[PDB]
Structure 1
Amino acid sequence: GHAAGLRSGTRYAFSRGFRKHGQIPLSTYLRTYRVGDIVDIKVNGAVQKGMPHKFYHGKTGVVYNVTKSAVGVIVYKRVKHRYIEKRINVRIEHVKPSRSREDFLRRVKENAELKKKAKAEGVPVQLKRQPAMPREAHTVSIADNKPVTLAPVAYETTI
C-alpha cells in the first residue's frame, strides 16, 4: 500500500503560474450564481478553505445550492461499471461561470427571430446546422500569375 494523501500528486496542478502570485482580483467575489447554473471548477492554490478534491479540478457541473460564501455542485463520476452522482461544496474562489452553453443560448434566440421574420414575409428558411460540404467548380486565371516550376534539390553538408 503506497502513500495516498489528499493532495498527493498536485505539485504542478495546484500551483499558481509564473508571475501570477499575490493579490486575487476582486471581480471574483462580485459574481452571482443561481440554482441551475453551469460552472466549471478550477482550484486556486492561495485559498486553503472550501477546497475540492483533485479529481474535480477541471470538471464541469450544475449548481444545486447557494449559501453565504459557497455553492453546491453536482458531478458524475465513473467507478468501473457505472456512474455515481457526487455533491461537493466549493468556495466561490474556485468556481467560474462556463461558456459551454452560450452557443446554444445564442442560436435559440436567433432562430426565434428568423422564424418569425420568415413567417411574416413568406419564404422558408433552414434553421439547423450542416457539416462542411465539398467545394464547387470554379475557374482560375493564369493572367499575370504565371506558374513557377520547382524541382528537388541535391544533397549537401551544412556544418
Structure 2
Amino acid sequence: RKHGQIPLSTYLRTYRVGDIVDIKVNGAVQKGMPHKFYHGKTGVVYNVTKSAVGVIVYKRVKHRYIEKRINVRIEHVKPSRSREDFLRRVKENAELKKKAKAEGVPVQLKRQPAMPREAHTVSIADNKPVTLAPVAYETTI
C-alpha cells in the first residue's frame, strides 16, 4: 500500500449479510478501525450499515472461544476468496451432475488428491542421457 490516494473501488463493493470478509486495516484513515488484534482476521458479516459492516470473529480466551461482534468500516474490509473455491465448485458440480444425469454416465463427484502417476514410455531419441560424476569435471578444472 503506497502513500497518498486511496483507490476508489473500495467504496464500490456491495456488502451483504453472511459474506466472508477479512480485516485489512488501512493506515491512512483513522475512523472506524478495529483493535490492534482482529487485524488480518476473517469473519462473517452480520450487520451492514451506511458506511460500515459488522463482522463476527471468534476470539480465543484461556481454554475456550468467545464470539465477538465488531463494527469495521468498508475501507478496512475486503472480500475473501476463502469460499470462492466452494462457490465455483458447487456451481460446477451442480451443472456437471445435471449434465451427467441427463446423459446417463456417472462422473466423478468429489475432488481427488494427488494420485501416483501411471506408466508411460520415455524415448531416448535426440535426448540421450549424459553421464554425471559426483563432482563436475569443469568444477575440478
With normalisation by structure 1, the TM-score equals 0.81
Structure with the larger strand share: 2
Which stretch has the larger CA shift, 148-157 or 109-118?
Answer: 148-157
Indicate whether 1:146 and 2:128 are aligned.
yes
Higher mean displacement: 72-81 or 116-125: 116-125
Change (3 A) 1:102 1:157: closer
Identity %: 100
Residues 70-97 of structure 1: per-residue CA shift (max 9 Å, x gap) = 1111000111100000011111110011
- Give, in whole Å, the separation in 1 of the partners of 2:33 and 2:67: 19
Select 1:85's aligned residue among 59, 67, 85: 67
Q: Deviations over 1:113-138 (max 9, x none)?
A: 11111111111111111111111112
Shift of 1:153: 3.2
Task: Call closer, same or farther: CA 1:49–1:158 in 2, change over 3 Å.
Answer: farther
Structure 1 segment 1-159 matched on structure 2, within 5 A? 20-153=2-135
Is there any run of 5+ residues in structure 2 with no aligned partner, and where? none
Instruction: Give TM-score scaled by structure 2 length.
Output: 0.91
Q: Secondary structure at the residue paired with 2:117?
A: coil
Shift of 1:111: 1.2
CA-atom RMSD in angstroms: 2.5
Distance change (3 Å), C-alpha of 1:119 and 1:149: same
- For residues 128 and 157 of structure 1, the distance between their equivalents in structure 2, rounded to whole angstroms, comes to 51
- Structure with greater contact order relative to length (CA < 8 Å, sep ≥ 6): 2
